[PDB]
Write a protein that binds this ligand. Structure first.
Ligand SMILES: CC[C@@H]1C(=O)N(C)c2cnc(Nc3ccc(C(=O)NC4CCN(C)CC4)cc3OC)nc2N1C1CCCC1
Length: 127
C-alpha cells in the first residue's frame, strides 16, 4: 500500500540456455507445487492494497511468488537451477518473516516447502 510493480520476469539481454534441471524445475517442481491444496496464496504477488496490509512492503523488500517463478522459467530468465531455487526459498522466508509462527499461512508455506525440498532432492544430474 501502494503496491510495488511485480518482479522482473524477462530480460532479452540475458543469455539463455535450456537445461534438464531448469526443465525439471518448470515441468515438475513448479507444476507440483502449483497444484497443491495450499498453493493459492503463493500463486501471485501479495496484493497488500487489497489485503489492507500497508506494512507488507515496508518489511518485505524481496518479494517473490510462484506466478513470477513460472514466468521467469518460461522466459529463460535463469541461467542456473540455483537461481530458481533461491527464489522459491525467498518466497518461503518472506512468509516466515512477515507472519506469526504457527499461523495457517505459515503452515501452508511449510507444507509447500516440505514438498519442494522432496522434489529438489530428486533434481536430475546436469547433462
Ligand atoms: C500477506 C500476508 C500473508 C502471506 O504471507 N501471503 C503470501 C499471502 C498471500 N495471499 C493472501 N491472500 C488472501 C488472504 C486472505 C483472504 C481472505 O479472503 N480471508 C477471509 C477474510 C474473511 N474471513 C471471514 C475469511 C477469510 C484472501 C486472500 O487473497 C484473495 N494472504 C497472504 N497472507 C495472509 C493475509 C491474511 C492472513 C495471512
Amino acid at each position: 500500500s501502494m503496491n510495488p510493480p511485480p518482479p522482473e520476469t524477462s530480460n532479452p539481454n540475458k543469455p539463455k540456455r535450456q537445461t534438464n534441471q531448469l526443465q525439471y524445475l518448470l515441468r515438475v517442481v513448479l507444476k507440483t507445487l502449483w497444484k497443491h491444496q495450499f498453493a493459492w496464496p503463493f500463486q501471485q504477488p501479495v496484493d497488500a492494497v487489497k489485503l489492507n496490509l500497508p506494512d507488507y512492503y515496508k518489511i518485505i523488500k524481496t518479494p517473490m511468488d510462484m506466478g513470477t517463478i513460472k514466468k521467469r522459467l518460461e522466459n529463460n530468465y535463469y541461467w542456473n537451477a540455483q537461481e530458481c531455487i533461491q527464489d522459491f526459498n525467498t518466497m518461503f522466508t518472506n512468509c516466515y518473516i512477515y507472519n506469526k509462527p504457527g499461523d495457517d499461512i505459515v503452515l501452508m508455506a511449510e507444507a509447500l516447502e516440505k514438498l519442494f525440498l522432496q522434489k529438489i532432492n530428486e533434481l536430475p544430474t546436469e547433462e
